[PDB]
Design a binder for this molecule. Sequence first.
Ligand code: ZXQ
Ligand code: CL
Length: 260
Amino acid sequence: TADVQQKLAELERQSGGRLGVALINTADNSQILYRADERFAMCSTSKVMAAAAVLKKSESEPNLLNQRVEIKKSDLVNYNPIAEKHVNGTMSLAELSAAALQYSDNVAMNKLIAHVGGPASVTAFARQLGDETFRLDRTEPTLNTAIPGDPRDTTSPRAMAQTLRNLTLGKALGDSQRAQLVTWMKGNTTGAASIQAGLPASWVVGDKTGSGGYGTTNDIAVIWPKDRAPLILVTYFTQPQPKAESRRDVLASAAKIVTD
Ligand SMILES: *[B@@]1([O])O[C]([C]C([O])=O)[C]=[C][C][C]1[N]C(=O)[C]C1=[C][C]=[C]S1
Ligand SMILES: [Cl-]
């Protein structure tokens, strides 16, 4: 709809920030796009690509997810909800992936990054999939600075929607690995006020949120509406003031506009 475009523009205006939306509707292979080719800081939405890279690696190393990783005090960063419970012990790569995806643990993300060879290796994995837009430049916590004009740790809504579709509904990952990614995303604990908040209660959602400087507030989701083909939705939002507050409501509103 041109109506949908007008409503998204209205939402953006009211919000004071910059909104990026990409919806893929697998029912009819249509898209709804708003600033979908602009770059936005991914913040923790990048953790999907890092977990996917480990899942890919596990297809040629079948006991990889059980591999143990030491957690030390020196690993702690700014937000360690799961890793702080495991200091001086080990977590498996499966546990780290779950912590990164479901609690947005930042130590967990740094262990996924390190395992696969660093930010440039996560980026090369994206390229191998056909995503030529995604770039992961830094580790946690600095990858979330979200400075306007800074291309580090950014992607576009279009690219991220196409990539999430490939990862969750397509064939980027083997069936076991794809199912594990989907299960992890469906068990997310951080997204109930974001895309989920703009959809009917009966719909099933797997999502990953992100937040960072400049009031950056993000969510990427695979959605199974009741008796419908699935949708992929990326909603990215960022604001002009360095210390702007979170605006999860804006993502909920965008989700409601594009699925109404
Ligand atoms: B990451 O972006 O994911 C979130 C998800 C959310 O808010 O729903 C929460 C915690 C980990 C992430 N965010 C941050 O680390 C915030 C910042 C880090 C450095 C500067 S701001
Ligand atoms: Cl409802």
